[PDB]
Amino acid sequence: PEWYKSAVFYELSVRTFQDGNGDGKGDFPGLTSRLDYLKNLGVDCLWLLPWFPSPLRDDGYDVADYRGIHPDLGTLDDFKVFLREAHARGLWVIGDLVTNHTSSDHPWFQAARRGPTLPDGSPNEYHDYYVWSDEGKEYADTRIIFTDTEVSNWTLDEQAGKYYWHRFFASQPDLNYDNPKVVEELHGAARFWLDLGLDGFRVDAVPYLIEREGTSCENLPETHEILKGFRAMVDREYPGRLLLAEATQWPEEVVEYFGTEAEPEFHMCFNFPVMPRLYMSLKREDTSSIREIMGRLPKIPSFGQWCIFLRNHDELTLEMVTDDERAFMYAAYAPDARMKINVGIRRRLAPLLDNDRRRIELLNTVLLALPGSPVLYYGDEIGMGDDLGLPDRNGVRTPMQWNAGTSGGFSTAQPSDCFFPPIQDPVYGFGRVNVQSQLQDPSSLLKWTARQLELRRAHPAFAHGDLTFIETGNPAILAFTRQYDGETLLIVSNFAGNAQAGLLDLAPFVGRAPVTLSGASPLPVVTGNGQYPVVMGKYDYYWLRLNS
Amino acid sequence: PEWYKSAVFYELSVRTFQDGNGDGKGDFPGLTSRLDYLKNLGVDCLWLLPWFPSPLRDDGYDVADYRGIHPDLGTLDDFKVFLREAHARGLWVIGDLVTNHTSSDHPWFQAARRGPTLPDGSPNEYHDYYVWSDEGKEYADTRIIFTDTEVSNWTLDEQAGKYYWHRFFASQPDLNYDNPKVVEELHGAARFWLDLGLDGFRVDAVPYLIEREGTSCENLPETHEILKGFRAMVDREYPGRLLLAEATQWPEEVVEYFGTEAEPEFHMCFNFPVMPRLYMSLKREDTSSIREIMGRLPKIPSFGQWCIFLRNHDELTLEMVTDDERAFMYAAYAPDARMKINVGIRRRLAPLLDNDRRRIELLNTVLLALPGSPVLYYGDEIGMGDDLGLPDRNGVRTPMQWNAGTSGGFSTAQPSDCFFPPIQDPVYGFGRVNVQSQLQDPSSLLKWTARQLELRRAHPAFAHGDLTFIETGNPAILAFTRQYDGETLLIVSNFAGNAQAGLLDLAPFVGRAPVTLSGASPLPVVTGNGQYPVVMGKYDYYWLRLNS
Numbered sequence A, B: 001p002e003w004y005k006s007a008v009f010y011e012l013s014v015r016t017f018q019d020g021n022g023d024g025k026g027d028f029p030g031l032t033s034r035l036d037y038l039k040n041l042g043v044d045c046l047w048l049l050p051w052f053p054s055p056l057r058d059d060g061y062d063v064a065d066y067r068g069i070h071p072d073l074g075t076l077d078d079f080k081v082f083l084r085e086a087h088a089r090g091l092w093v094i095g096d097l098v099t100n101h102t103s104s105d106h107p108w109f110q111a112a113r114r115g116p117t118l119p120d121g122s123p124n125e126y127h128d129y130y131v132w133s134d135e136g137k138e139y140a141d142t143r144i145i146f147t148d149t150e151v152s153n154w155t156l157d158e159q160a161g162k163y164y165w166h167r168f169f170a171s172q173p174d175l176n177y178d179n180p181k182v183v184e185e186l187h188g189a190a191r192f193w194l195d196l197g198l199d200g201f202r203v204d205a206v207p208y209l210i211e212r213e214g215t216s217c218e219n220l221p222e223t224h225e226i227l228k229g230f231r232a233m234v235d236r237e238y239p240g241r242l243l244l245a246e247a248t249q250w251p252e253e254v255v256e257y258f259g260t261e262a263e264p265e266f267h268m269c270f271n272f273p274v275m276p277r278l279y280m281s282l283k284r285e286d287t288s289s290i291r292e293i294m295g296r297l298p299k300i301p302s303f304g305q306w307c308i309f310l311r312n313h314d315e316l317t318l319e320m321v322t323d324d325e326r327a328f329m330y331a332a333y334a335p336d337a338r339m340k341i342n343v344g345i346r347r348r349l350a351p352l353l354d355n356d357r358r359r360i361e362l363l364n365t366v367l368l369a370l371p372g373s374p375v376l377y378y379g380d381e382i383g384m385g386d387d388l389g390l391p392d393r394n395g396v397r398t399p400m401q402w403n404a405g406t407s408g409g410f411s412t413a414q415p416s417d418c419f420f421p422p423i424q425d426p427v428y429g430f431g432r433v434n435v436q437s438q439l440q441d442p443s444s445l446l447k448w449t450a451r452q453l454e455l456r457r458a459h460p461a462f463a464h465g466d467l468t469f470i471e472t473g474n475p476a477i478l479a480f481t482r483q484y485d486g487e488t489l490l491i492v493s494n495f496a497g498n499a500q501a502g503l504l505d506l507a508p509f510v511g512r513a514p515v516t517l518s519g520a521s522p523l524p525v526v527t528g529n530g531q532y533p534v535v536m537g538k539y540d541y542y543w544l545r546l547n548s
């Protein structure tokens, strides 16, 4: 099995994890100095948010140089020391590859906006890197992702006197993927980090590569053909590396980003479809949407693995739910207007769940039990909160809370001088929520998370097994089996806030003896018709194995 | 029923609870400012720790005066305005009436140590307030309560050329209740206080205030007789006022401190026998000794009400258990030698349980669901810790952690300047553990404790019902009914740290449905032989109702 299929992933931002030089901004020596924490947590793969030169208008997703380290973060040598130190402990590291767009400061765009003809009359080879219209009327009816900021995906450049296309901020013009030259520029950018030993990339915003009149300009077959060539290049020149897709689409579209056995595409795709449903079910005490949306997801190819997640550095996206589900999620998880942004909710995991550790634990166990490799949002493992006074999605990117000291140990700069201010409020601030506290606390959420990954790590069925929902006769009780190489696990979760009963249909397993995976406390052998009664307490989770 | 049977009791110490003036010592004006917090928590009755003037060689239980206010805590003025406010919100206030002994610095000993006759020739009336002994051989077959500090109960005084008796410290000379001017002086002690508004007293060290040869000098019939007088004096002169007794003995010998219907002693008595087997059964994951010690209590009189508790201002006493049980307890709950004292363990409740909230919540449920009126020890509702760098049992008596400011909000004096230092450590300290934080946090242990009080108060069969244990087929699962007034509670509690299956014996309720007390989700209907199957997750509590 390929290494990503057994990996626990951890998403962090360099600028926001550990400040190492007192200026208030995270950097590569600060991260390096913290690799022991990441390793002893149970993390296998670090996914780093963009680290390139950038004005930071979309926090570095507006790349101005695909081949440097951003001056806030240190030097290209600092990055080389970090990559070497992470590999010595057995961590993989992936980067973030912004294929769809660059920053409007990228030298390419500064050359492109000078018109099709550079002022001495010869053709301007860069003008064509980007996507231009005389009046910005093409691709109408296509939607706007940043609904609270942009009013058109086209914008007029003052010096070219034409419009350019951008699916995101106006400072992030789309790259033109019908220009073969653009394809090689990025294959070459991927080559520069892969040559240095990077283990692969998260690949950003992949559904939006190619645009076509008369289409939504999402999931276009031309976009898949490009992504196929990225994999064909990685497959030939860098066997073993990982390509992981960001694609918030509906199930029948997401699964396509794996390609096929004959035409592979991505190795991994975030399971965006399940993520909203975890939160809906919890609030409805009805888990059917989890089962319904899961059942819409086709089998993926042999090399493929889902990456399961609860929250990331973005808002909780309601882009891919129905109008009614969206409206239901806003009412349940966004009671204040300031809580929402671009068809999303911009809150951290713990505040989404009313800080109820039981609910945090339940979803964290659903995160570890579905088919796939899990990704942890940095700081979620100590129960970090949010700062919704910050703009856009910055509120869920406050600094990591290392201890109760100056700026939660993130920096020796004062809180007001850090890149984003470290949280200080009585519930979620660093005096109460910090890593030092929770390493010394015997029953902290940090120790739980570690123990629970330790638990997962000891049963490969969690990483490689099939999946089979079990009828429970109570919508509050979600039940499934995970089967692999002999072992059968049976996973039972109550999404209600009080005690619940069910009749598990274990008819296929009559005469088997369930045991807890933690300590093998025995449960009644399944007998008779196999209709098996269970009771559960509020948010309980049963991790069992079925012995034959 | 009488108000005590239906009340929530809160134990606190004025010195430790809230400083009003700035000198690092909790005073009555300050306690009076925190009366709303106790009201909103759902507490009915404050049991205070001795507020009387003292040298404090045993935090107020070496009493030098019985009829005034220790100047640390403020004035008698202040006490008035305090008892006026506690009553102006619906709070009963009881007091600690220290009986078997006084402080060696109490006028009646100061005078008594001058000998059996004054130098002028007139018999010293006071010399026989206390027990004396020419050659200290009278009363050998006796144990010393404080075995870490006292070698014997006799202490040779100098100025009276004589030994004198103390069951506790040499600075607490025992009182002589073969003297009737003594008895009068402690009926007169009371009269002082109940006449101002007080509602009763906890009675200190009842089983030891009468001593006689050839015996064990505890629980002697001569001793119970005086107590009957106190009750008699109180029923006669102050009707509807409480008497609660510290009676750490084996069960039957304790029940005797209630009186009988004919001649009655104490209304209320701490259920010392059960409090240790809770801790034992959690570690053993085997509740059998919880039943056994409740199954060895005799029924109690009508007016009689057990007082239930988990922890208090002392250590966790292990005095009344078998020598096998006392070794296991130490092995389980005192890994470090300096955590023991006087055949006991001097740790707070949250550290005793590894700061594991699930375990904390569990014992609290069983607290509030066993037959009695419960007493909560201050700070346990937020999870406070213990400081073993304090002497005696003062490690579980640190300042109330109110917020995250100067000294936890307990005082404006810095931590070095407080009567005892607040706790500052990364786990239990007041930057992480305080009231302000827990007021603001939807799922805090504070709000959980007051939610569970609200839930106890909607179901009077907790205070007033009887009690019947139910078979479960698994010693880890403790279940019992509490019936009263045509309502039946079914209380099911799992003491194991992993999931447990049980077979509950519900034969008497065939055709009834258990429904959760919280949220009213019904469980399946008891059918057949009433062998009702259950599964529980680690430390679950099911609070159910059985409908006709």
Ligand SMILES: [Ca+2]
Residues within 6 Å of the ligand: A100, A167, A174, A175, A208, A209, A210, A211
């Ligand atoms: Ca594009």
Ligand SMILES: [Ca+2]
Residues within 6 Å of the ligand: B100, B174, B175, B176, B177, B208, B209, B210, B211
């Ligand atoms: Ca005595």
Ligand SMILES: [Mg+2]
Residues within 6 Å of the ligand: A019, A020, A021, A022, A023, A024, A025, A026, A027, A072
């Ligand atoms: Mg820095």
Ligand SMILES: [Mg+2]
Residues within 6 Å of the ligand: B018, B019, B020, B021, B022, B023, B024, B025, B026, B027, B072
């Ligand atoms: Mg004071």
